[PDB]
């Protein structure tokens with residue numbers, strides 16, 4: 001029995017519970033009428049994520065081979081981006097990933113702690129009034145500035161990039177605007193790369209350009225695709241991580257009391273938010289080169305697989321009978337896999353942990369009484385099916 005993912009994300013908790021119930025391999029419908037499989041249990045996700053029969057090569061997708069995927073499908077930017085580390089495996093994946101991954105180790109991202117701290121304090125300084133949209137005024141700008149600095153993007157481009165990524169991630173973007181959004185994104189990223197080719201810097205775009213002389217030899221198009229990937233994957237997720245941590249503390253007063261009183265550390269808030277309420281509900285997209293058994297089902301060769309990180313985060317087989325609860329003090333035998341698992345594991349994990357690990361204590365140090373300004377049930381997800389993304393975060397600064 002297929003689960004059609006709600007394009008309007010009207011009850012994400014209920015949909016996640018249905019996906020777990022239908023697992024480990026659930027039949028699902030992506031917005032736009034595209035049928036795929038979703039892995040929704042922790043153990044089977046880890047196996048599929050390291051299974052060499054589950055590849056990123058879209059030429060393996062039967063629906064792609066048959067020409068049944070429209071180029072103006074709103075999800076096309078997520079399902080079929082340009083060639084980058086995201087869309088390859090094997091030796092090509094190593095070549096396309098190594099520079100970025102090594103630039104983002106925990107040791108390397110510490111270099112940015114000062115910039116992240118200064119950005120955080122500057123944003124907190126500008127909060128005005130008793131009630132604010134903390135997403136628009138804080139959680140959204142911080143990771144956009146951070147990834148823009150990382151990648152050498154001109155800060156003057158960030159307002160437009162924000163407008164474009166809103167369309168990129170929405171299920172409701174009309175066909176002409178799907179296409180126009182991807183073309184304009186390509187232009188902004190190409191302009192950034194062209195600028196760094198002329199004057200190479202410490203930013204990661206410059207580093208990729210230099211390595212394409214000096215070893216890795218990514219093509220011009222692959223560098224632009226990698227830049228777009230880094231901005232897409234690095235701002236949207238980190239914003240939701242900060243938003244969801246504030247929501248979770250505001251809906252669990254004992255957990256808020258623990259961390260604000262020093263009985264638990266902020267890292268535990270971040271890690272439990274990642275497990276309980278990941279920024280990334282689903283990851284597109286993998287394809288079976290051969291029939292693959294999953295539980296009592298067979299994933300047929302040529303079919304597609306998404307990984308339902310949101311659903312599997314609350315898998316009771318992984319975390320026990322309290323897996324559906326937000327508990328920053330929990331003991332579990334299984335660490336969460338909200339950054340993925342295997343070769344494609346998020347290279348930005350340390351940077352996101354640093355951003356959230358700086359932003360959250362700074363926020364509550366400035367505003368110890370900070371609370372949602374509305375009952376949490378009134379918060380509304382944007383029509384973004386792969387990301388847990390809220391329209392706004394009304395907050396009383398207290």
Ligand code: HEM
Pocket residue numbers: 085086087097147229230233234235237238239241278279280283307309337338339340341343344345346347348349351352
């Ligand atoms: C903030 C929380 C974040 C979460 C929850 C997250 C989640 C993930 C996950 C689950 C994957 C692997 C998907 C899969 O293979 O199934 C991934 C890949 C990736 N992420 Fe993150 N991410 C976050 C932040 C970031 C940041 C800050 C950056 C960049 C600075 C980034 C860049 C990437 C890239 C480039 C990939 C592709 C890696 C590959 O396929 O080799 N992410 N992310």
